[PDB]
């Protein structure tokens, strides 16, 4: 057995180039640069192997930020042009990530404003968006679908007899809940009304659905768990009771259903069995908004605070203070928490810092964004933008990529 061996020269020499390429594909960018300068054959293996193209492709496959910029900048056109093009492209992407991260930290952004032009009862209670459209629920009882690029209104969906308070859509249906106490199912392509669920005794304040099941919650203090075999075949599975006031928000995954209420509590339920698990206490007033994913629950309250919780032990990991009014909507991803308040203000929080108990409180709010003139009812965001809607009857697109 030889003591040392040049794997990257030896493998291509015996006709096993792909194994040598696979070894180098594990390298980070800087180590790939180092491998380039080892010797001429190492350089040839990385170059003939298109290792820089493969590194960018691996990042697009595993990072939504890289994936998003591949689509937005247009160099994803070339993925899935010589090797040197991708080697020169990689630092351009890095600085493009750093300019975006700086824009979030400093709040440099462009702004698009949609005036929903509500004739009588003004306000946009809920929204969801993709690259093509923004679907919005309004106090005038309609759902308006806007073109993400031209900002024009493409479809108005009518049928609810009260405000559209909550909505979610996938590639097949839009599902909405309303002050009229009904849940309605619409064809996301044509807008045709497909189903109406009569069940709740009071306004349907929130809903989520995924993978054939849906949870709805209501001012009637109950949660309903539904099985959806199809847009037209939806069966009530269980009714969860235990909240002592209106249930303002519900979220779930395969492990748990998470609900929050005017009764100042978050309640955790087993998704499989619909059995109660635990109550999260801590907020001093009712809870207005919530998001749950993995082990993290983030909630906003009438007490003007945001709380981070671990779902398994129920511990509150961090209290976020700073909002001057009721925290009305909240979302988070892997990097940030974005929240909106009754005073029209939006705040961006450093989630990694917030989950580190060593970080001081003053370093947690990255920025405050003030462009709404009324209560912020709903927001959704990603690596590049925030989309928010308000009582002021506008939808705002905050774009942090210039």
């Amino acid at each position: 057995s030889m003591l040392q061996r040049d794997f990257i020269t030896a493998l291509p020499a015996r006709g096993l180039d792909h194994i040598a390429e696979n070894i180098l594909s594990y390298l980070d960018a800087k180590s790939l640069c180092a491998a380039e300068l080892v010797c001429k054959e190492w350089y040839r293996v990385t170059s003939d192997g298109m290792l820089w193209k493969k590194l960018i492709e691996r990042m697009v496959r595993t990072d939504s930020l890289w994936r998003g910029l591949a689509e937005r900048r247009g160099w994803g056109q070339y993925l899935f042009p010589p090797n040197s093009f991708y080697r020169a492209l990689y630092p351009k992407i890095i600085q493009d990530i750093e300019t975006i991260e700086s824009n979030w930290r400093c709040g440099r952004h462009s702004l698009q404003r949609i005036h929903c032009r509500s004739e009588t009862s003004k306000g946009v209670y809920c929204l969801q968006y993709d690259d093509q459209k923004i679907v919005s629920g309004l106090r005038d009882n309609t759902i308006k679908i806007w073109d993400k690029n031209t900002l024009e209104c493409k479809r108005i969906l009518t049928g609810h007899t009260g405000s559209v308070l909550c909505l979610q859509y996938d590639e097949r249906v839009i599902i909405t809940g309303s002050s009229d106490s009904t849940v309605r199912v619409w064809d996301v392509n044509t807008g045709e009304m497909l189903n109406t669920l009569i069940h709740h005794c009071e306004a349907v304040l929130h809903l989520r659905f995924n993978n054939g099941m849906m949870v709805t919650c209501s001012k009637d203090r109950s949660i309903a768990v539904w099985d959806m075999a199809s847009p037209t075949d939806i069966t009530l599975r269980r009714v969860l009771v235990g909240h002592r006031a209106a249930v303002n928000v519900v979220d779930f995954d395969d492990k748990y259903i998470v609900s929050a209420s005017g009764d100042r509590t978050i309640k955790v339920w087993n998704t499989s069995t619909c059995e109660f698990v635990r109550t999260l206490n801590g907020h001093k007033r009712g809870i207005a908004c919530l998001q749950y994913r993995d082990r993290l629950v983030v909630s906003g309250s009438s007490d003007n605070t945001i709380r981070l919780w671990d779902i398994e032990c129920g511990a509150c990991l961090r209290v976020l203070e700073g909002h001057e009014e009721l925290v009305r909507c909240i979302r988070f991803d892997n990097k940030r928490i974005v929240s909106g308040a009754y005073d029209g203000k939006i705040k961006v929080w450093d989630l990694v810092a917030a989950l580190d108990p060593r970080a001081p409180a003053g370093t947690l709010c990255l920025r405050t964004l003030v462009e709404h003139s009324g209560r912020v009812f709903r927001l959704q965001f990603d690596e590049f933008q925030i989309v928010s809607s308000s009582h002021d009857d506008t939808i705002l697109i905050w774009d942090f990529l210039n």
């Binding site: 308070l165 002592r244 006031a245 303002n248 005017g262 009764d263 009812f377």
Partner: peptide, 10 residues
């Protein structure tokens, strides 16, 4: 309060 959320008051 807006129609989307409600407190625990009577």
């Amino acid at each position: 309060l807006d129609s989307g959320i409600h407190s625990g008051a009577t």
